[PDB]
Short mmCIF file of C-alpha atoms in Angstrom, two decimals:
data_model
loop_
_atom_site.label_atom_id
_atom_site.label_comp_id
_atom_site.label_asym_id
_atom_site.label_seq_id
_atom_site.Cartn_x
_atom_site.Cartn_y
_atom_site.Cartn_z
CA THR A 276 17.15 4.09 -7.48
CA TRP A 277 17.11 6.50 -5.15
CA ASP A 278 13.71 8.56 -5.97
CA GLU A 279 12.33 4.82 -5.84
CA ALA A 280 13.23 3.89 -2.27
CA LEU A 281 11.94 7.61 -0.91
CA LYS A 282 8.47 7.15 -2.77
CA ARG A 283 8.79 3.43 -1.12
CA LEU A 284 9.18 5.17 3.00
CA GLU A 285 6.63 7.69 1.81
CA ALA A 286 3.79 5.24 1.08
CA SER A 287 4.98 3.15 3.61
CA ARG A 288 4.72 5.56 6.40
CA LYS A 289 1.66 6.73 5.17
CA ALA A 290 0.51 2.62 6.06
CA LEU A 291 2.12 2.90 9.27
CA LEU A 292 0.68 6.25 10.73
CA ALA A 293 -2.97 4.91 9.67
CA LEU A 294 -2.74 1.32 11.31
CA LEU A 295 -1.54 2.84 14.37
CA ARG A 296 -4.34 5.62 14.24
CA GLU A 297 -7.22 3.38 13.35
CA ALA A 298 -5.92 0.55 15.83
CA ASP A 299 -7.95 -1.01 19.42
CA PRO A 300 -5.69 0.99 22.01
CA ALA A 301 -5.57 -2.35 23.72
CA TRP A 302 -3.76 -3.93 20.65
CA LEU A 303 -1.29 -0.70 21.08
CA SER A 304 0.13 -1.77 24.11
CA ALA A 305 -0.36 -5.71 24.07
CA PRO A 306 2.95 -8.31 23.34
CA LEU A 307 2.72 -9.40 19.70
CA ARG A 308 2.91 -12.93 21.28
CA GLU A 309 4.61 -15.09 23.90
CA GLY A 310 7.26 -12.02 25.70
CA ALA A 311 7.44 -9.81 22.59
CA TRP A 312 7.18 -6.00 22.33
CA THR A 313 4.14 -3.82 21.72
CA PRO A 314 3.21 -2.43 18.50
CA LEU A 315 3.97 0.71 19.82
CA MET A 316 7.59 -0.26 20.88
CA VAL A 317 7.96 -1.50 17.17
CA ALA A 318 6.90 2.29 15.96
CA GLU A 319 9.72 3.51 18.44
CA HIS A 320 12.31 1.34 17.14
CA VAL A 321 10.96 2.29 13.42
CA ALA A 322 11.86 6.54 14.09
CA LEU A 323 14.98 5.48 16.03
CA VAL A 324 16.33 3.88 12.96
CA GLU A 325 15.63 6.81 10.60
CA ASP A 326 17.06 9.24 13.54
CA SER A 327 20.13 7.23 13.14
CA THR A 328 19.94 6.68 9.42
CA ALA A 329 19.50 10.19 9.11
CA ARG A 330 22.89 10.90 11.43
CA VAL A 331 24.79 8.46 9.52
CA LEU A 332 23.73 10.27 5.92
CA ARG A 333 24.84 13.60 7.99
CA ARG A 334 28.00 11.98 8.01
CA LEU A 335 28.81 10.90 4.47
CA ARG A 336 28.23 14.18 3.45
CA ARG A 337 30.94 16.07 5.92
CA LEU A 338 33.30 13.36 4.60
CA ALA A 339 32.29 14.28 0.85
CA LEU A 340 4.79 4.32 25.91
CA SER A 341 1.95 6.37 24.78
CA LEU A 342 0.46 6.80 20.98
CA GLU A 343 1.18 10.68 20.93
CA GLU A 344 4.63 10.30 22.49
CA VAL A 345 5.08 7.55 19.72
CA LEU A 346 3.65 10.04 16.66
CA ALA A 347 5.99 12.46 17.51
CA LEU A 348 9.10 10.68 17.41
CA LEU A 349 8.14 9.58 14.04
CA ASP A 350 7.19 12.70 12.87
CA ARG A 351 10.45 14.09 14.23
CA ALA A 352 12.94 11.59 12.77
CA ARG A 353 11.07 11.34 9.55
CA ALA A 354 11.59 15.29 8.82
CA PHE A 355 15.08 14.77 9.59
CA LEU A 356 15.83 11.86 7.54
CA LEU A 357 14.16 13.79 5.28
CA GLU A 358 16.34 16.72 5.72
CA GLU A 359 19.27 14.85 5.18
CA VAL A 360 17.93 13.31 1.97
CA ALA A 361 17.10 16.59 0.11
CA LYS A 362 21.09 17.23 1.06
CA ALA A 363 22.40 13.54 -0.03
CA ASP A 364 24.30 13.02 -3.42
CA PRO A 365 22.43 9.33 -3.90
CA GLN A 366 25.99 8.33 -6.02
CA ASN A 367 28.53 9.66 -3.19
CA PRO A 368 31.48 6.06 -3.17
CA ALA A 369 31.62 6.77 1.00
CA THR A 370 30.51 4.25 3.38
CA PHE A 371 29.34 3.88 6.50
CA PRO A 372 29.09 -0.16 8.61
CA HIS A 373 25.27 -0.60 8.40
CA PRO A 374 25.24 -3.48 11.18
CA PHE A 375 23.57 -5.86 8.85
CA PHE A 376 24.19 -4.84 5.62
CA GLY A 377 27.88 -4.00 6.00
CA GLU A 378 29.27 -0.93 4.46
CA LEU A 379 27.00 0.91 2.90
CA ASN A 380 26.85 4.30 0.96
CA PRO A 381 23.94 6.84 0.99
CA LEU A 382 21.48 5.50 -1.70
CA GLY A 383 22.80 2.62 0.41
CA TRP A 384 21.53 4.01 3.86
CA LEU A 385 18.71 5.21 1.97
CA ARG A 386 17.23 1.44 0.92
CA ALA A 387 15.31 2.72 5.63
CA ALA A 388 13.01 1.80 3.34
CA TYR A 389 13.34 -2.28 4.12
CA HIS A 390 13.58 -1.62 7.51
CA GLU A 391 9.84 0.47 7.32
CA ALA A 392 8.28 -2.33 5.01
CA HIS A 393 9.70 -4.85 7.41
CA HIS A 394 8.53 -3.65 10.52
CA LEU A 395 4.28 -2.48 8.84
CA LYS A 396 4.53 -5.89 7.89
CA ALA A 397 4.72 -7.58 10.81
CA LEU A 398 2.10 -4.90 12.47
CA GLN A 399 -0.09 -6.05 9.32
CA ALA A 400 0.35 -9.67 10.44
CA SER A 401 -0.54 -9.14 13.50
#
């Protein structure tokens, strides 16, 4: 449900921020494997997708490098996302295409929760 996805996003964010803040600096900037991106790139990716999600939610409503840098990007996008979540109608039938999930309404877009869980899991596995 809408409230469940949101409570999940709140939990996975605490887990992510703690992982980043407690990580060895050398690991943060190291490739996860050969040719792979780093944990800090993963975190920036999470932030950009939440920013993008927040803009999708805003459209659906209208139709109705460094740790410091990465942490700041996370906070900003998450504040923006939460603002749009507060303004959303979970039951809004209007849809916007998600590159992987296809046509999703605002609830589908918030269920963001899977995205952060997935990337957090990948980082913990590393």
